[PDB]
Amino acid sequence: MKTPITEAIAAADTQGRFLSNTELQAVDGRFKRAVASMEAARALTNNAQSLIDGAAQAVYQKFPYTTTMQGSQYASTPEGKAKCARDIGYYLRMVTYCLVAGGTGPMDEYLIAGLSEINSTFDLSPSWYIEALKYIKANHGLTGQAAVEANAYIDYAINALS
Amino acid sequence: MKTPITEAIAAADTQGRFLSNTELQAVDGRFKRAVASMEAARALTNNAQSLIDGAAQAVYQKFPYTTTMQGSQYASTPEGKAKCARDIGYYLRMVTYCLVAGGTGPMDEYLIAGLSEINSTFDLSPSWYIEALKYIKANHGLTGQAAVEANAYIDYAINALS
Amino acid sequence: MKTPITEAIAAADTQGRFLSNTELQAVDGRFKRAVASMEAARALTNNAQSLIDGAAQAVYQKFPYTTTMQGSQYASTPEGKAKCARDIGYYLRMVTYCLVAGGTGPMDEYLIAGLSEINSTFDLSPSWYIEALKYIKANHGLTGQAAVEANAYIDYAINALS
Amino acid sequence: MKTPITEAIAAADTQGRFLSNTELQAVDGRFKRAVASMEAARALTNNAQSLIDGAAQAVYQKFPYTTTMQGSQYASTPEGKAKCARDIGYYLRMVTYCLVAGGTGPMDEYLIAGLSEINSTFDLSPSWYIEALKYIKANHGLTGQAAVEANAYIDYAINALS
Amino acid sequence: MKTPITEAIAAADTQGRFLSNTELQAVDGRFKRAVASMEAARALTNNAQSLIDGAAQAVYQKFPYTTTMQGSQYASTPEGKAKCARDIGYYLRMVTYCLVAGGTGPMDEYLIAGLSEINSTFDLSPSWYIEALKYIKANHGLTGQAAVEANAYIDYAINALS
Amino acid sequence: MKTPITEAIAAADTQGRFLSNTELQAVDGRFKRAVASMEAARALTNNAQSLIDGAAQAVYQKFPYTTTMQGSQYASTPEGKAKCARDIGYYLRMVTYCLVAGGTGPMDEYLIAGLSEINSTFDLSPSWYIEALKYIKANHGLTGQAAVEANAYIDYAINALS
Amino acid sequence: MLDAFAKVVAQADARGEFLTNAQFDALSNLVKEGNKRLDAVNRITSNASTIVANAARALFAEQPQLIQPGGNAYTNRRMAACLRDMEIILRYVTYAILAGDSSVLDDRCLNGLRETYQALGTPGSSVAVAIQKMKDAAIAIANDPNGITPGDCSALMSEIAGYFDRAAAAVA
Amino acid sequence: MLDAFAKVVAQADARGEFLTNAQFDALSNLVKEGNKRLDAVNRITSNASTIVANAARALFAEQPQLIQPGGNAYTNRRMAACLRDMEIILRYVTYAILAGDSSVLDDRCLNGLRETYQALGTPGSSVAVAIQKMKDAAIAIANDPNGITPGDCSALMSEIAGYFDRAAAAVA
Amino acid sequence: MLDAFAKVVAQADARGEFLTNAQFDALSNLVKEGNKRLDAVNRITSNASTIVANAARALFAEQPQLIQPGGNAYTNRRMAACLRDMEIILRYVTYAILAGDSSVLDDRCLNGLRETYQALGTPGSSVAVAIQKMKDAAIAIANDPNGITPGDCSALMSEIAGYFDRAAAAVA
Amino acid sequence: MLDAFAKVVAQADARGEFLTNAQFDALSNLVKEGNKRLDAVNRITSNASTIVANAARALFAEQPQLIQPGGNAYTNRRMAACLRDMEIILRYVTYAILAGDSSVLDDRCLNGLRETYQALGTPGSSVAVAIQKMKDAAIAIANDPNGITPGDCSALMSEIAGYFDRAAAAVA
Amino acid sequence: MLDAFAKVVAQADARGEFLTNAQFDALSNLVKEGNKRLDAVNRITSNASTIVANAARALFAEQPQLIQPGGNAYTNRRMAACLRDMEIILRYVTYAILAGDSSVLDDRCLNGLRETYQALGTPGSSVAVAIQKMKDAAIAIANDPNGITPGDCSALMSEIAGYFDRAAAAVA
Amino acid sequence: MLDAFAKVVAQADARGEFLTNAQFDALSNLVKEGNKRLDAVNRITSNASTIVANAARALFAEQPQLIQPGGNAYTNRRMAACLRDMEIILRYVTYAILAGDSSVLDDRCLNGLRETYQALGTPGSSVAVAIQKMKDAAIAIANDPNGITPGDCSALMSEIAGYFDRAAAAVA
Ligand SMILES: *C(C)[C@H]1/C(=C/c2[nH]c(/C=C3N=C(/C=C4\NC(=O)C(CC)=C4C)C(C)=C\3CCC(=O)O)c(CCC(=O)O)c2C)NC(=O)[C@@H]1C
């Protein structure tokens, strides 16, 4: 899983080398930044439900046809809304994992790999999940470097959908 | 050249990826540590001559035969001493380069590559250059994290000779 | 370009072999089937405009939001409708090419390669072009084996979008 | 085994693709041609003995030394003639297999692979089996496309011996 | 070209090594054996014409059909006999080259490479050239180790034809 | 193991070939040279102790510091001298193996492979073992080709240390 | 790889026999039915995407534990791998329908597939459910009596069923 | 690789046009003549070995310096390489006859072949002689009026001639 | 690959000199400005997709011949290849912004890129237009004064501009 | 490969849960102790060569049969291979100390190492002795209270001990 | 790979001993007999083709079921594979005769050959018959007293016999 | 690769001639002198390390700019590369001395070496100095009249000189 530490180790184990000051500097940067990433992950976690419930409506307002059209890919049924809210939670939960781990690994492994195959097979439009990510990014209520960490991994998701 | 930044870029250009928060944390750790590395490099540079001249004698005392034996590999001639002092300077100068660059790259490229072939061809004993590195490590007069940076790259040289 | 003849040749040039009765049977099957494919291509070509203009409305009716939403990816502007009608023509024209050539090559080369990258970059939903292909398939007015050829290459497009 | 159908499948399984109209045309050509190939195979089979017994004499007349010279490679003994007649049957039987299968596969697998190693090791001259194939080709009594199929696979054998 | 010396060098240049006593022993064995190989090559050369003219008749007697049958592959014409005598000379001349060089290289390069393709294309039977080689082997009039060298390279030819 | 015979076989098994006069000449050269190599190996073996005991002193005289300096790598202790005498025996014993086998194989396998890693890890100077090899080369009391074989493999060791 | 013709050939060669009329009639009849075989292959192939999708949608409706966290089809990488397997299986089935012989399906898909699903820990019994989901959908599509020259394909539809059961039997 | 159909397709796409009747008639006529094209390909292929051999035998009769010591076709390795080239050229010609287009012959055989024969020092002008040797023999075989439904193949035999001259022009 | 630090190192080694204060001060200042460099890299990277898309949309609005039939960006394979090149160029620019040195951009992207666009026939002058399209958009994003500690990044924004012009100069 | 953070992540995902405070506090504490972890890694790495050498010297003093003729560490090729293994083991231990998790040590070093030493006939019980030789030396070096900000690293030194025993347990 | 000399070397090194006279005399005697060994290798090699052929001809005369349809040596591909195996076995025997040691024969031919003939279903007991067919023929050729300096090669001919039995024992 | 014997062979084959006595005498004389050639090869090879070292030491004494900072032999990687080239050149010279022909030296060392030293910027004129440094040292060693059967090797020592000048001529 891609974290600052596994990259530092991977770079050394690749060249057959022991760790060096080159790699330890990289991990010291992780340990320092962790203070800002943690409080971002804590906040997103504590306000996770209001952010999911608001993100779902931001989508149903922007794309109202998803609540009226027929088809298992749409949120026009109570089961479809449950599925959508679930997926939005999945995205938010991966953002917290990325902050806790210090890198994209969690999202890379659990979400981004296979995204295009699934979104196509099940006729899910990426525009929907980007709108939900834009709503979280605007309303997570973070400030300073805690917000820089959150948006970094939210924009990373958005670029994966674009 | 192996620095924290070229590794961070290399890790991204390898997987075909844009940079990410995973890599930027690694460079922030370099920029932070630079404060302690710089003042170490400045000090070694300002006291470079006394450290070379003392390192040379530490060697000629530990291995006195290098000043009395016949052979172009020994310091028993004025030209041989010049060569030895030169080589000791080379080692110290690479240590400063490693501190300025933030990694082993300078020493890897300019010194460690080919060391075993040269030390064997010219019948130069690694024990000599380790003793000179041990004298610098003890007498560079650094304290705190400035000293941790210096010894990190001096021990890295010593391990390359061992 | 993937046709029955280039495959037959490719299979021989691969194994270093001259053509054989194995491959000539394959081309005789192309020459025979050509009678049904040609009259399909002729018909789609002669009624190409009514099929494009009807296919465009089938889409604007099924997904009415494409004519009212703001964004360069939608047909809510006269330039956007021109683009959509153009794309629908492109699909139909590739179907005729596939019938004339006797295989998927034309569509493979000119349309399917890069489809997922473009449809994602420009936020074009595959559901739109499948609906346009379903309208052509129902209303091309072909019967018998001429219709079997047309639907074969229209469904092949639809599967590429699914 | 190389048939029109296994090639069509092989071409698809190679590129990771489902079958397409490109490949189904190739098999339709096999199914059509089968009518002419079958009646050729039936005829060669029903008159197989007279064609072998006549083919053997065509050889013993053209190359009379094969019936008078000493050596296990020649037909100057009753066991040697049995072996020759057997081999001629083998060739004819592979021709029928090729017609039934729709391609060279049977002959490729069971006869052509290793032909040069065997004909050299046992000092069997290819001129002998070509003469036997020329006699069958002239006297199989086929007409029209049934004859085109037979000669196609008989000449294919002859080219393998040349 | 495969000689004892080029093999000894090839074995060293392969492993990146200087020559060693292992390889020089191999060449000393060549220089020693050369005395017996030279006088064999000298003898075959001095009696080359009688050996070719006798070898040709040994063939025309064993396989008399080669002088009566029609076809450009046979010696039933004055041009065909010239060609046969030429080919027999070629074989003998390569045997002398192999003795002069100390190995199979000359015959490998100039004769054995492509032998099966040519003997098949032009319908030349290997039995003919083996009989000519058997006549030379019996009548070259060599004794002792000079004869061991000659037969070594004549049998090597025969095995290449078998 | 690299001997003249295993090279001759290796060269044949590499190209898929039977042995030939090219390779048998190489082994005949080994069998001939064996007479001079054997009597060299016999002599070194019979005077092995005086050659080791004299070789050890040649080293302790040339590099007297090895008997006075502190450290497990030096011969300043009775255990260190035992180790040195042992190593010198090892070198001499490998020279006899090389003469018995007819090539470098024994020394390549048992001594040269890993020499640089060991001599560096344990801080053993190659200058020491070369001096011991120079003393053996001067005092083995061989003459003629027996001496040429001995020095060939002693110089081969010296070049491996240089 | 063998087809219905190469198979009969391989069985005659083993006994060193020419073909008999009993076999020239069986193979001639196979040819007589080729058009049906091609419609079937065309019909299933042109609905590959819907077959896999609807079959996947139904498998996860009946077995919702495959898609909840910790499930073998949880995350997009394992979901895609799962949809892929369904597509790959349906792909080698359509190969067998065209060859009239299951050899390609066995050598290049099913053989060793049971051992694979047990190494990675996938419920082969769930894969088997997915396979017979596509079977019923494919036969429905292949045997659809609409827009096609009327006739009896019951024998063919039974052969097609054999290939699916063969696949679901090899994983379950 | 292009055939007569894919070529017309590629030319319409460049202009963004559907095909016109002028092209639906030209391609329909190509189909009408397919049987002739297949006889031609079959006839030349089934006499490949004799075409190359007799052509080789005649080339070396007219130019006996190619086979005397020091000649480019001297030794069996260069003789075989030479017979091989003749076979390879005839092989990509028969590909073009089947595709109705010379593209495969150009990309995968002729393109760069002149530069190759000058690097190794082969007389390309002699290769050109060999190529038109096989041309006359192949046309004789392909246009043989015996044992085949009578008709006019003169247009086809001219196209076949174009592929050979194209090859002999690219090396000479 | 070199960064601003390794570059200064490589220049001292060539003269065999230790660093002087003039260089210890220049490199210390580079460190002082590192936070700005990281915001810039983060800001451009997190808007990579919109930068390339809007830049592509505008290039094809101004030069509609790139996308009409026969155009170099016609068909989806060449459109994707074109969007890819734009993404690849922007990717090696962001590498240079982080390294403070253009070496990676030159060795691994720009070097030889002009020769490539002329072999396949792509309008390098149009690529150059695309590159300065992304430049203006990226600087706008990187220098956005909103949601970030106020300060002067004008020097940085000029360096970033140099990398884009360097790229558009190497293809035009 | 997992580190202490990715491990906790992987365990939450399996249950589909966000992290709880019990875990945000454990991981925050890990960060609080990072400086100690880095000193430990730096200290062991900068004495790698002496650790392996002195450990090797002592192993061969206690077990002199490993180095007498016929012994598994006899000849320079097996001596070097042995010193190499000691270096490789110490290298993947220092990786685990930095990751706070033994995964890299298990997947890429220890897993399958017991089967390897039994195929070539090496005394794994002697390798185990070598491993705990380096353990005592490395802890001595890592926990040296001299020239470093005073504090308690006892918890860390225990974790480091676990990685060595894990390695010596996997070979013995 | 070992020869008679390298074998003795490898056995002394394991005990750390110089060679004794008992071994300097045995190896000197081996040299004394080298000329015989070379005649033997030359004689068998120069009749390789006849040895394999006549041995094959006789094997198929005694066991005609190997060559009737369905037999393991039926078809030319399995006949050639069979003649090849006979040639390959005779080739590694002649290697052992020259090395004075069977190591090359074991490592690079016989080792694992029994498992191979059982996977493909070949009668190893028939291979064993073929091997001792070539044995009797090779000894006849090698020990032929004609055209060679008279002497006793009985010891050598026994060693040669050991290599063949070793091979036929490893497959039967 | 050719040796003195294969060269004469290749020249006879081109004319299709058997060898004449003029050539059987020249090659027989070459054999007569083989022992000298072997002493020469042995003597130079057994002093390879000292030849390269002393030659390197002297080159850098006369041209001290090759080893000062910025010089082409500055740093250990370029020093080693330089000592390597000297060793590689001396290695292919000793090959030519044994083959009696320079072909191996030309094809596998010198050919293209001038173009290489100009791409990386190495002073070929300095390489040439190094090559004739080893020449004088090697001839001194090879022609040393001590501890060897007295005789005239002047012809041989001249041939050896030709190989060195050939190498130094190809780089200068
Ligand atoms: C011109 C080359 C000479 C010639 C050709 C010719 N043939 C026909 C008719 C047919 N040719 C074929 C050949 C094939 N169809 C296949 O699928 C295959 C490969 C498996 C082959 C080889 C067939 C089937 C026919 C139809 C049946 C028949 O025998 O007639 C014609 C008449 C035109 C037509 O297309 O029917 C011609 C002219 N005849 C000559 O005189 C030319 C020298």
* Resolution for the entry shown, Å: 2.5
For helices D21-46 and D145-161, give the axis angle rounded to 10 degrees.
90
Of the residues H28, H36, H41, which should be mutated to test ligand 1's pocket, given the most ligand atoms within 8 Å of the CB? Answer: H36
Burial grade of D57 (CB within 10 A; 0-12, 13-18, 19 or more): exposed
Distance from C-alpha of B47 to C-alpha of G14, rounded to nearest angstrom: 91
For helices D21-46 and D4-14, give the axis angle rounded to 10 degrees.
150
L contact chains, 3+ CB pairs < 8 A: B, E, F, H, I
The ligand 1 site (C-beta within 6 Å) comprises C 21, 24-25, 28; D 33, 144-145, 148; H 35-36, 38-40, 42, 142-143, 145, 148-151, 153
Enumerate the residues of chain H whose CB falls inside 8 A of the CB of residue L16: 68-70
* Minimal Cβ distance to A125: which of C64, C125, C162: C125
Q: Which residues are CB-neighbours of C85 under 8 A, at least 6 positions away?
A: C52, C53, C56
**Is residue B29 a contact partner of residue B130, using CB atoms and an 8 Å limit?**
no
Does an interface of 3+ CB pairs under 8 Å exist between B and C? no
Going through J17-119 in order, the beta strands assigned E by DSSP cover none
> What is the torsional sign of CA K41, K45, K50, K53?
positive
Task: Tell me the nearest-neighbour CA distance from L67 into chain I, angstroms.
Answer: 11
| Interface touch C147/G50, C-beta < 8 Å | no
Length of chain F: 162
| Interface touch B162/F125, C-beta < 8 Å | no
What end-to-end distance do the CA atoms of chain C give, in Å? 23
> What is the torsional sign of CA A120, A121, A124, A130?
negative
Distance from C-alpha of A131 to C-alpha of F150, rounded to nearest angstrom: 84
Enumerate the residues of chain G whose CB falls inside 8 A of the CB of residue A109: 75, 77
Distance from C-alpha of B15 to C-alpha of A104, rounded to nearest angstrom: 13
Q: What's the 3-state SS for chain I? A: CCCHHHHHHHHHHHHCCCCCHHHHHHHHHHHHCHHHHHHHHHHHHCCHHHHHHHHHHHHHHHCHHHCCCCCCCCCHHHHHHHHHHHHHHHHHHHHHHHHCCCHHHHHHHHCCHHHHHHHCCCCHHHHHHHHHHHHHHHHHHHCCCCCCCCCCCHHHHHHHHHHHHHHHHHHC
Q: What is the CATH number of the domain that holds D58?
A: 1.10.490.20
Length of chain L: 172
How far from I161 is each of G99, H62, H98, I30, I142, CA to CA, in Å? 62, 71, 57, 18, 11
Centroid of ligand 1 to alpha carbon of C105 (angstroms)? 28
**Is residue A22 a contact partner of residue B4, using CB atoms and an 8 Å limit?**
yes
CA neighbours within 13 Å on the CB side: how many for A112? 21
Question: Which domains are assigned to chain J?
Answer: 1-172 (1.10.490.20)
Distance from C-alpha of G172 to C-alpha of G168, rounded to nearest angstrom: 6
Going through chain K in order, the beta strands assigned E by DSSP cover none
For ligand 1, atom 11, which residue shows the shortest CA distance? H35
Give the residue among J63, J113, J64 at the shortest CA–CA distance from J85.
J113
How far from F27 is each of C88, F24, K26, CA to CA, in Å? 79, 5, 18
Centroid of ligand 1 to alpha carbon of G62 (angstroms)? 59
Q: Which two tokens stand for residue D75?
A: 């037909």
The DSSP code sequence of C18-58 is: PP-HHHHHHHHHHHHHHHHHHHHHHHHHHTHHHHHHHHHHH
Closest atom of ligand 1 relative to the H145 alpha carbon: 43
Going through chain G in order, the beta strands assigned E by DSSP cover none
Give the DSSP H/E element, type plus range, for residue B77. none
Distance from C-alpha of A3 to C-alpha of G108, rounded to nearest angstrom: 38
Distance from C-alpha of B81 to C-alpha of L172, rounded to nearest angstrom: 34
Distance from C-alpha of K136 to C-alpha of K140, rounded to nearest angstrom: 6
Q: Which residues are CB-neighbours of B102 under 8 A, at least 6 positions away?
A: A21, A22, A25, B3, B4, B5, B30, B33, B34, B37, I5
> What is the torsional sign of CA D140, D145, D149, D155?
positive
C-beta neighbour count of H98 within 10 angstroms:
26
Distance from C-alpha of L107 to C-alpha of L99, rounded to nearest angstrom: 14
Q: Which 8-state DSSP code applies to residue L18?
A: P
Does an interface of 3+ CB pairs under 8 Å exist between F and B? yes
Distance from C-alpha of E123 to C-alpha of D131, rounded to nearest angstrom: 13
Q: What angle do CA E92, E98, E102 make, to 5 degrees?
A: 155
Centroid of ligand 1 to alpha carbon of G160 (angstroms)? 37
Distance from C-alpha of J87 to C-alpha of J85, rounded to nearest angstrom: 5
* Minimal Cβ distance to E162: which of K42, K49, K147: K49
Distance from C-alpha of F83 to C-alpha of J156, rounded to nearest angstrom: 40
Enumerate the residues of chain A whose CB falls inside 8 A of the CB of residue C70: none
Q: Which residues are CB-neighbours of K46 under 8 A, at least 6 positions away?
A: E151, E152, E155, E156, E159
Give the residue among K85, K99, K45 at the shortest CA–CA distance from K167.
K85
| Interface touch K6/F19, C-beta < 8 Å | no
- 3-class DSSP state of J89: helix
**Is residue J167 a contact partner of residue J110, using CB atoms and an 8 Å limit?**
yes
- A7–chain B Cβ distance below 8 A for any pair: yes
Chain centroid, CA J7 distance in Å: 19
Enumerate the residues of chain L whose CB falls inside 8 A of the CB of residue B87: none
How far from J120 is each of J78, J81, J124, CA to CA, in Å? 11, 12, 11
CA neighbours within 13 Å on the CB side: how many for A145? 12
Task: Tell me the nearest-neighbour CA distance from F147 into chain B, angstroms.
Answer: 27
**Is residue D133 a contact partner of residue D157, using CB atoms and an 8 Å limit?**
yes
> Residue positions of J in the annotated binding site for (2R,3E)-phycocyanobilin?
82, 153
Q: Which 8-state DSSP code applies to residue H107?
A: I
Domain residues for E34? 1-162
The chain G residues in contact with chain D (CB within 8 A) are: 1-3, 5-6, 8-10, 12-13, 16, 18-19, 24, 27-28, 31, 34-35, 38, 41-42, 45, 48, 91-92, 94-95, 98-99, 104, 108
Length of chain A: 162
Length of chain K: 172
* Minimal Cβ distance to F114: which of J52, J53, J76: J76
Distance from C-alpha of I82 to C-alpha of I49, rounded to nearest angstrom: 14
Distance from C-alpha of K133 to C-alpha of B9, rounded to nearest angstrom: 68
**Is residue A73 a contact partner of residue C63, using CB atoms and an 8 Å limit?**
no
| Interface touch K68/G13, C-beta < 8 Å | no
Determine the residue type at H130: A
* Minimal Cβ distance to G53: which of A110, A113, A121: A121
Distance from C-alpha of E22 to C-alpha of F4, rounded to nearest angstrom: 5
- 3-class DSSP state of G71: coil
- A159–chain I Cβ distance below 8 A for any pair: yes
* Minimal Cβ distance to I42: which of A152, A159, A162: A152
The DSSP code sequence of G75-87 is: SHHHHHHHHHHHH
For ligand 1, atom 29, which residue shows the shortest CA distance? H149
Q: Which two tokens stand for residue K37?
A: 């060994």
E contact chains, 3+ CB pairs < 8 A: D, F, H, K, L
For ligand 1, atom 36, which residue shows the shortest CA distance? H35
C-beta neighbour count of K149 within 10 angstroms:
10
Determine the residue type at D126: P
- A108–chain I Cβ distance below 8 A for any pair: no
Task: Tell me the nearest-neighbour CA distance from C19 into chain G, angstroms.
Answer: 20
Burial grade of J27 (CB within 10 A; 0-12, 13-18, 19 or more): buried
> Residue positions of F in the annotated binding site?
84
Give the residue among B79, B113, B120 at the shortest CA–CA distance from L75.
B113
Closest atom of ligand 1 relative to the H42 alpha carbon: 22
C contact chains, 3+ CB pairs < 8 A: A, D, G, H, I
Residue I109, marked binder: no
Quickly tell me which residue has 């012809």 as its tokens. L155
**Is residue F63 a contact partner of residue B65, using CB atoms and an 8 Å limit?**
yes
| Interface touch G14/K68, C-beta < 8 Å | no
How far from K147 is each of E43, J140, K151, L151, CA to CA, in Å? 19, 80, 12, 40
Centroid of ligand 1 to alpha carbon of D144 (angstroms)? 10
**Is residue J154 a contact partner of residue J31, using CB atoms and an 8 Å limit?**
no
If one counts the domains in chain C, the total is: 1
